[PDB]
Amino acid sequence: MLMPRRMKYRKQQRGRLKGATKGGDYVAFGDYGLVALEPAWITAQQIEAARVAMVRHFRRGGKIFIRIFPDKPYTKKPLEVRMGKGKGNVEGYVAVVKPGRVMFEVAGVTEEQAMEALRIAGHKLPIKTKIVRRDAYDEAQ
Kindly state the helix (H) or strand (E) to which residue 64 belongs, with its residue range: strand 63-66
Number of residues that bind Mg ion (CB under 5 A): 13
Instruction: Decide whether 79 or 83 has the Cβ nearer to other proteins.
Output: 79
Report 93-112 residues binding Mg ion (CB under 5 A): 97-98, 101
- Among Mg ion, other proteins, none, the one that 16 touches (CB under a kind-dependent 5 to 8 A) is none
**The one among 49, 63, 66, 75 contacting other proteins by CB under 8 A:** 63
Inter-residue contact 57 to 49 (CB < 8 Å): no
How many Cβ atoms from other residues are within 10 Å of residue 137's Cβ? 10
Q: What SS3 state is found at 102?
A: strand
Q: How far is the CB of 120 from Mg ion (least distance, A)?
A: 10
Q: What SS3 state is found at 121?
A: helix
**The one among 37, 52, 110, 111 contacting other proteins by CB under 8 A:** 52
Kindly state the helix (H) or strand (E) to which residue 33 belongs, with its residue range: strand 32-36
Inter-residue contact 90 to 74 (CB < 8 Å): yes
Q: How far is the CB of 105 from Mg ion (least distance, A)?
A: 14
Side chain identity at residue 16, one-letter code: R
**Does residue 85 belong to the site contacting other proteins (CB under 8 A)?**
no
**Segment lying near other proteins (by CB under 8 A), choices 8-16, 17-25, 95-103, 121-129:** 8-16
Distance separating the N- and C-terminal Cα atoms of the chain: 31
**The one among 29, 49, 77, 132 contacting other proteins by CB under 8 A:** 29
- Among Mg ion, other proteins, none, the one that 98 touches (CB under a kind-dependent 5 to 8 A) is Mg ion
